[PDB]
Design a protein around this ligand. Structure first.
Ligand code: SF4
Lengths: 56, 215
């Protein structure tokens, strides 16, 4: 947050809490909007043998 | 069968008791044997029914090429019977009940021997290709499943598969066997089952070699 030190002190005293530790505006701490590809594993029924549907 | 028809006049002339004198109970008479493959003297010979396989091979076929220790596997009753390794062929007899007990079946008493110098997977795949080329195509299990097994065995010969596919091929063979119009499907399923049962480590080794050299 681009806030002056005096204004930060005034708002901290007025609220009674330290605002800088828990800010309500998002910043660079959030994840990138471009992500690597996933792999997404398969479920338990993807076996090649001993997988007859009548048993599940 | 031709042999069944041809032995009948001799049976009538000499009596059924004479014919039943040979062989064990429920396996009586004499049989024609065709020994072929990796033997010094491949040949056709008529001999008493319940002869030991090793004794027949040594006495009439001249022994296994390179000696008895050189033996790798035997197909005892034609291409439709599962293979057996040396440990089974050591002390097995040649008749219906004893060969069924060895999980093979007497079949047509056509002995095809293979020494330790032959690709057993290649031989089984060639047999499966024969069965693919010989199915009449009437019923779907034989037609589609034998085509499928032929493709899978062709991939197996190179190791292009994964170890999990061995059990899948076994299940495919079971799905073919007992579900077809005639016994050609059974005769194609049994050699695959025998090859898996007696040489799964070789198939896995081939798969590992292919994966290693293909990465
Ligand atoms: S199992 Fe017999 S009837 Fe069925 S497709 Fe094969 S050869 Fe034809």
């Amino acid at each position: 947050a681009s806030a002056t030190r005096v204004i930060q002190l005034l708002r901290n005293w007025a609220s009674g809490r330290d605002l800088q530790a828990k800010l309500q505006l998002r910043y660079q701490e959030i994840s990138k909007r471009t992500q690597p590809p996933p792999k997404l594993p398969v479920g338990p029924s993807h076996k090649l043998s001993n997988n007859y549907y009548c048993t599940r | 069968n031709v042999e069944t028809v041809a032995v009948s006049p001799t049976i009538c002339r000499r009596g059924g008791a004479w014919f039943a004198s040979f062989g064990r109970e429920r396996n009586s008479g004499t049989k024609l044997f065709n020994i072929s493959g990796h033997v010094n003297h491949p040949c056709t010979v008529e001999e008493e029914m319940s002869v030991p396989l090793k004794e027949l091979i040594e006495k009439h076929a001249g022994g296994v090429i390179g000696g008895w220790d050189n033996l790798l596997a035997v197909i005892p009753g034609g291409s439709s019977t599962p293979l057996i390794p040396k440990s089974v062929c050591e002390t097995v007899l040649m008749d219906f009940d004893a060969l069924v007990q060895a999980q093979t079946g007497l079949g047509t008493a056509a002995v095809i021997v293979m020494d330790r110098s032959t690709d057993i997977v290649k031989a089984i795949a060639r047999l499966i290709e024969f069965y693919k080329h010989e199915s009449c195509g009437q019923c779907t299990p034989c037609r589609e499943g034998v085509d499928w097994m032929n493709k899978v065995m062709a991939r197996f010969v190179k190791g292009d598969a994964r170890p999990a596919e061995i059990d899948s091929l076994w299940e495919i063979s079971k799905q073919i066997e007992g579900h077809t119009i005639c016994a050609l499907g059974d005769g194609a399923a049994w050699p695959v089952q025998g090859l898996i049962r007696h040489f799964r480590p070789e198939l896995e080794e081939r798969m590992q070699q292919f994966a290693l050299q293909h990465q």
